[model samples]
Target: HAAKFSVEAGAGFYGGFGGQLAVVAEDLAPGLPLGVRLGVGFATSDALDDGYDLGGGTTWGDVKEAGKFSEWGQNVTLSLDVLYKPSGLGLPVEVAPYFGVRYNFFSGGYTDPEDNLTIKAQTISSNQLGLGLGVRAAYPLMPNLSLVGDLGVDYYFQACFTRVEEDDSGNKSQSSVCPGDSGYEDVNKFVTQPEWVLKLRLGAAYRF
Candidate 1:
């Protein structure tokens, strides 16, 4: 018997803005404009070792040579899109344009032994709400497999996070601040801005 729904597993290796593994329902039913995608993603960048500028005369950048950074992150998303195959356009691949909201879990810590100081901050997307607009293109490879490419533009809410800093004299202070904080005139002061971030991924999908 033919399957009721077409299920697919795809990987661009996974990212909301970085990398992804996803499950897609190509055709939810019959003659439907709807399809579904559930995916997990991760992203890393050269900015991992970057410092914060809390502009009101506080935070990490005040330290000389704020280097030695390490971090990790993950993304989970569910989205819905319309499957469109234009007849007159003579297009080679099928396309699905989608809208989605995602959740991210990420954090990192660093230490500066040279200045007799160590700082660890939870610069994560804990209180953030994010949005994405993207398109998935599929080029058929065989009967049950397709080459998939995904691209998205992202808009993230402001940064709201906390961190603990230990001074050289053995005093530890922790601060949690949001957009309205003293020096936080911008979003990325907490790591992540309001700018529209562009991301892309390419891989293959197997329909089951």
Candidate 2:
């Protein structure tokens, strides 16, 4: 009993416009195609002011570290997909070429209520991972209704997430009321480095 391969099951439903939904799958290989994908997507409703100046010069005593809140929340994308398909090139539409290594897990958090701004924590949350390349197109517009299109790209090895400060009892237990000014300090090493994004995606695929 060493020749058995036939498994195909599919389910996906998605909505877009802020409040979204996503259920995905591609786990069925007849000849020799790999599959493993799980998905979850979410969005609230507001975010786009463009404020990401961390450790830059403006006020906070001129650069060295002093910047927070780069617009966050209302954006949740948790996904893991490790799949590959590459064999021979048989042409006539129905081409299969896919490669993915993705992890962009993020909830949301960024708020500094002007209560001094220390170096421990005043609401900061982020997670990132992206390395994806995509292609999938099938054409046959009627008989069984087959028209699919999927192209993907993501190149991120070690994305960013920031929240810094080691001790001093976390600098008087966070929120230092602008001590010594200088970028709202509680000083002991601070971190929140995130700057790497190159993403583009266009969708339309159906094979039932």
Candidate 3:
């Protein structure tokens, strides 16, 4: 039995001002129809204002408005998957579909308006389940290079999270956005709407 592996890397834009990066790897038995793999991915915004930041509300003067932040945070995820391919489908119609589940974690820092602090720390711990459908087609181009592209989507489970903060007098206040009853809502009034992020990636694959 020989070990076989493949790696893929991609970047895309979603929501508005946010950016995403994904890296995946898989291993399969040589000349086998079934295979398995493991992969990890990380994604976050260039600024907290990306993807509809609710801000502290009308009283805050557009703090959540896109590209307006003195501080921001990031998110990360780790995953494992099992893969399968059916050969009877015929040529130029190869489809390798995959299903995977991952546990996601987040960590970052942001500024607080209540105490006027420059930075505050935060984190997120949650579970994510993902599914993808892909196809590979080869067409003659010129001589050495061929055209290739991949399309896929990821569904994340309630990534809503928050950051913690305290004042000079040791009193706590809003830091980030998350669920549950916290003092953050009292001032910020920006609640997480419970949603998922979707993305599409297309590019070329080079083989020698």
Candidate 4:
């Protein structure tokens, strides 16, 4: 048997679309039914606000003062999955079931709308680790390309948040805080703390 390799890109999951390299490792072990995918890309989370704006405008801020204080930020996501293809499913599209882990980011900040300078304790960002189980189905559009879609539920079992504060005397301090911490107040289950996250995305892949 021969192994197959492909490149996949789509908009979904932790924040947005990214690039993934996928492979069927059948060549190493002839009877193996396993495949793997690795990905790195830009992602955002509504877990904090309304989600990161891909257009880089004012998708992340609330109206305050005379003008809206625009909050801007970016997050990077990395994911890996090991998948199994059942031997004889007899389905219209190739089906793969997978369990994977993804590293995601969440953040928030505040600044003066007039001076564009830092304001108060601008709580910065946090990173989380999530585990997911999902299904991927692909339909071949042509010999070398296919359309792909993924659906999954993610459980963020590990999460951490931080805060940076500026005192009245012009001194700065930093601390780590999560959902249950004394200083932290945002109790959002998904982003502020470890909780459930839903993933649904669609895109395309290229066979190599």
Task: Provide C-alpha RMSD values for all models, in order.
Answer: 4.9, 14.7, 6.3, 6.4
lDDT of 3 by residue, 1-208 (tens): 5444444444443222233333333234657766554544556533232334344444223543332434544445555555566777675544556566655554444444443334343322233344443433333354433343434444555434454564445666654444444653442233222124454444333322
**Which parts of model 3 have CA positions greater than 4 angstroms off?**
13-31, 46-61, 64-68, 107-109, 112-150, 159-162, 166-194, 202-208
In order of appearance, the predictions have TM-scores of 0.67, 0.27, 0.54, 0.71
- Which ranges of candidate 4 are over 4 A from the true structure? 13-28, 47-67, 73-75, 115-123, 165-173, 178-181, 185-194
User: Which lDDT tens digits does candidate 1 get at residues 1-208?
Assistant: 2222444444442333455666666445455556667676555532232366555665554543555343444444343434444344458888777878755444444445443435433333334466888887889899877888877776666556656566557677776667677755544444542335566788787777
**Model 2 residue 33 distance off true place after TM-score fit, in angstroms:** 2.6
Give the TM-score comparing model 2 with the true structure, all chains together.
0.27
C-alpha positional error of residue 49 in candidate 1 after TM-score superposition, expressed in Å:
8.5
Write down the worst ten-residue block by lDDT for model 3: 186-195
- Per-residue lDDT of model 4, residues 1-208, tens digit only: 5777788877766443333334433223588778888866565433345443324554343333334444444456567888888888788798899999988665655544454345443546678787889998889898978899888787765556766766446688887867577645543431333357566778788877
Worst 10 residues of 1 by lDDT: 1-10
What ranking emerges by lDDT with the best candidate at the front?
4, 1, 3, 2
lDDT of 2 by residue, 103-179 (tens): 54433334443334443333333455665555555455665344555444555443333333333254522232222
Clashing pairs for model 3 are 161-177
Best by TM-score: 4
lDDT: the better of candidates 2 and 3: 3
